[PDB]
Amino acid sequence: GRFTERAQKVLALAQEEALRLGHNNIGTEHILLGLVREGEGIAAKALQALGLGSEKIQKEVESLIGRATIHYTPRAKKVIELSMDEARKLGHSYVGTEHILLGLIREGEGVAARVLNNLGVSLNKARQQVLQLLGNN
Numbered sequence: 001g002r003f004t005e006r007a008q009k010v011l012a013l014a015q016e017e018a019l020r021l022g023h024n025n026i027g028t029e030h031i032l033l034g035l036v037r038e039g040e041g042i043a044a045k046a047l048q049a050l051g052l053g054s055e056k057i058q059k060e061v062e063s064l065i066g067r068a069t070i071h072y073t074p075r076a077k078k079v080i081e082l083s084m085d086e087a088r089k090l091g092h093s094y095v096g097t098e099h100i101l102l103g104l105i106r107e108g109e110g111v112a113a114r115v116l117n118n119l120g121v122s123l124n125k126a127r128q129q130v131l132q133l134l135g136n137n
Helices: 005-020 028-038 042-049 054-065 074-089 097-107 111-118 123-135
Strands: none
Touching: 005 028, 005 097, 028 042, 028 054, 028 074, 028 097, 028 111, 042 097, 042 123, 054 111, 074 097, 097 111, 097 123, 111 123
């Protein structure tokens, strides 16, 4: 798995968020926070276009999980694996931010999904918004 610079920032931000919230396991919801906080990537732009924001996602994650060496949850590992499939299908050899978000949507379950459901975002609509940005001139 090769990652873009922005995707690497996402993974760092995800770990930072897990630690800040007192978790040794980096879950799908921490990936979600890393995606929105990274800011400049297509994932962050799609999340913002959907009416989500970093602070809003942060508040919801804290509401569902609360506070509590470091590892990815099994589901987060699966999301990162799926991100490579998503990149390949979109004609990319590197996983970028959009591919991690699409991987998250594809998994479709887990804490990030519960967060998105509570924030009122359809997974299908999230995918469409990502693809619209990628398709745009």
